[PDB]
Write a protein that binds this ligand. Structure first.
Ligand SMILES: CNc1cc(Nc2cccnc2OC)nc2c(C(=O)NC3CC3)cnn12
Length: 256
């Protein structure tokens, strides 16, 4: 039941390269009033990667939430598949926190956590999986560092569906990757959320990120506990047994 808007190649302009996603490159672009958008260009890929990419477009095209980024549609530009998504002003949260490290107030992080939990509450209610909750996929729409302002985030489309990704890619996503996904339930997004809470507390330094693939795989193999930052809450989320992780109803009540 794949449902999304087809964008004709004539309607898009590609501008500067912004970075890499999982098997994609992200560019600032225009969508014809033109609109500032981002263009996520899928690398030369087999049908099964492209299917997981279009399944993501389809999912995002059928949900709405103020803390979820918008998908404009998919464009086929010659051999390239291109997701056309919301340009979010201040870009990804992980990069932003690294640049602002040591002066991001805790009250600011708590607002961002709440907004993310409100997005994942909505997906939970809809029984839909995001599958890639991390600081890179949290886009900052409003800075909220000035006196009397608050931040505002948009969770990006999860990109190529996690189900299609390689073992090495799943390892690269530790510790955001729920441990049951290393070998397709909303439970995995509770683990991703806890790991993203740690990443935020630590000003965009995720636990275990500087470790090798075998070291990351070893940590999950031994069911080692992730560090404490929110601490009761991250612990509850970062439980190896998926059925033990709290609902977003509980997580959201706890955060307010
Ligand atoms: C400022 N606007 C902006 C910058 C950007 N940069 C970016 C992209 C990829 C990798 N690294 C990046 O930054 C260091 N990405 C985005 C998105 C977006 O959906 N990105 C993909 C990663 C989810 C939306 N707006 N936007």
């Amino acid at each position: 039941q794949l449902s999304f808007h087809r964008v004709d190649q004539k309607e898009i302009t590609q501008l500067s390269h912004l970075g890499q996603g999982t098997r994609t490159n992200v560019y600032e672009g225009r969508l014809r009033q033109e609109l500032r958008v981002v263009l996520k260009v899928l690398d030369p890929s087999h049908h099964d990667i492209a299917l997981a990419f279009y399944e993501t477009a389809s999912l995002m095209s059928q949900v709405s939430h103020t803390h979820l980024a918008f998908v404009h549609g998919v464009c086929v530009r010659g051999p390239e598949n291109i997701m056309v998504t919301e340009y979010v002003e201040h870009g990804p949260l992980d990069v932003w926190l690294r640049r602002e490290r040591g002066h991001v107030p805790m009250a600011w992080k708590m607002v961002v956590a709440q907004q993310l939990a409100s997005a994942l509450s909505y997906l939970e209610n809809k029984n839909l999986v995001h599958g890639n909750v991390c600081g890179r996929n949290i886009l900052l729409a409003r800075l909220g560092l000035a006196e009397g302002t608050s931040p505002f985030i948009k969770l990006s489309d999860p990109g190529v569906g996690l189900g299609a990704l390689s073992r090495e890619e799943r390892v690269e996503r530790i510790p955001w990757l729920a441990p049951e996904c290393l070998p397709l339930s909303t439970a995995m997004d509770k683990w991703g959320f806890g790991a993203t809470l740690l990443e935020i507390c630590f000003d965009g330094e995720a636990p275990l990120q500087s470790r090798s693939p075998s070291e990351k795989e070893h940590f999950y193999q031994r069911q080692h506990r992730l560090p404490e930052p929110l601490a009761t809450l991250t612990s509850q989320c970062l439980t190896y047994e998926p059925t033990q992780r709290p609902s977003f109803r509980t997580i959201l009540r706890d955060l307010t």
